[PDB]
Every structure is written in C-alpha cells, then in structure tokens.
C-alpha cells in the first residue's frame, strides 16, 4: 500500500483493476 511497491506488485494491482 506504500510508495515502494515492487514493479510486479504494481502489475498485479493494475491487472486486477483491468479484470474488474
């Protein structure tokens, strides 16, 4: 939930937004 999210974690959240 922080600024220092890894690139893979950023991927996952946007991927989950796209799905929903």
């Amino acid at each position: 939930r922080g600024l220092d999210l890894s690139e893979e974690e950023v991927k996952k959240i946007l991927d989950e937004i796209v799905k929903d």
């Epitope: 939930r1 922080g2 600024l3 220092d4 999210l5 890894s6 690139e7 974690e9 950023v10 991927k11 959240i13 946007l14 937004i17």
Partner: antibody
Framework: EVQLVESGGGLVQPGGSLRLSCAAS????????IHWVRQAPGKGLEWVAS????????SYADSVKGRFTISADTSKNTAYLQMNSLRAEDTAVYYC??????????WGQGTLVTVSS | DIQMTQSPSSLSASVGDRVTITCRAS??????VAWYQQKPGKAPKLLIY???SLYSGVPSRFSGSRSGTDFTLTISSLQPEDFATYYC?????????FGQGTKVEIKR
Amino acid sequence: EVQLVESGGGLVQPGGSLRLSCAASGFNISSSSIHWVRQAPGKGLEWVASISPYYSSTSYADSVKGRFTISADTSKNTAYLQMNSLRAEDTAVYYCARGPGYAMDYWGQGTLVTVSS
Amino acid sequence: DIQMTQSPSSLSASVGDRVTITCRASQSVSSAVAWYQQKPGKAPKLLIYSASSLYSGVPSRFSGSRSGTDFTLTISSLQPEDFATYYCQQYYYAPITFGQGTKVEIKR
C-alpha cells in the same frame, strides 16, 4: 464513480503560499498512492510529489523539497499540497492522481495556479 | 536519476496508418514504464503499464513493447479519436520522470 477533485488554485503573489487539496470519491485513499503532477502552459508533465496515505510516507521532486509539503487525511479521504516560497516557475495546472506505486491510473482535471505580482 | 528521452516531438499521419513513438531511458527501468494519452484541455489517461499491458477500456489498436532500454507505443491504424499528446513514464523509482511528449496530428 471514482473521482479526484482538486481545489485551492488561483492567482498568488511570488514568495507566497497556497494550499491545494484533492478530494477523492469511489475509493479509499489509503488503498493507493496519491501523486501531484504539474503542467506549465504549453509544456510537458512534471512530477511534483507523492504520498502513501496509509503509511504517511512521502517523496518530492528536487526543485520543491523543503518548500512544498504533501500530506493526507484519511478521515477526509483528501490529500493536500502545501506550497510555500512560490516562484513564477511554479505557474502550472496541478493534477492530482492515484495509482499503485508511482503508476498513475486515474487523474483529476487539475487546478490552475498562477504565481504573479 | 532516470532520463526518459521520447521521440519524435510531433508527427503527422493519416487515418488508418501505423504510428510508432519510442522512449529511451537513461538506464535500466526493467519493465516499469507507462504510457499516457492527453487530449487538449483534459487530464491524461493511462493507456499502457509495465511496457506492454493495456489498461481498462483501451482498444486493441494500441500496443506497447520493450527491448532493453527502448520502449515503443504503436497504434496500428490512427483513428480520429487518437489525435492527442502521448507521454512515456518510468515508475521504477523516484524521482519520477516523464518523456517530453509526442503530439500526434492527423494528415489531410
């Protein structure tokens, strides 16, 4: 119904202070990052500062450190940019945006700040 | 500090044509690159994240790719709704950097 609505811009004297705010709807600001990005007239996008409202952690572009402060209040679902020692160079449209990390997946329509005597 | 060098600064293309915008980073940003579209007088909208993933609502004609340090956004056939300015971004680490933008204008 995801929204980001900026307010607090306007015309301000050089060397003055201005506080921008960004009210968010349709999501909790502690679930993502909040970013301030500005666009001087006729120019590109320039990142200003970011915050994780959940951790309260912040980061800043070199040219605003010390004289700008980004903060957030989760109980108001709102973020802020306190701008001090304003210069002509800070004249711009200031967008608020949300997204994980430093990705910016939704942007508000921005507020115009004009710094002039 | 990461520089993002985007090219060209502007281009003119006809409707139905293929357009290619590239962004060259100063150092490795892995795949932590996004692309944004900005129409005049409006907020940018996210089109591509992690070099090659299309965001919500973005039609199948936009595509993104990476080769090492170079990043590319392609539109297969320019449609009139695609006139805008386009920006690359690295979200690898702060300070965050956007490329200078590319204004796509249609031919006539």
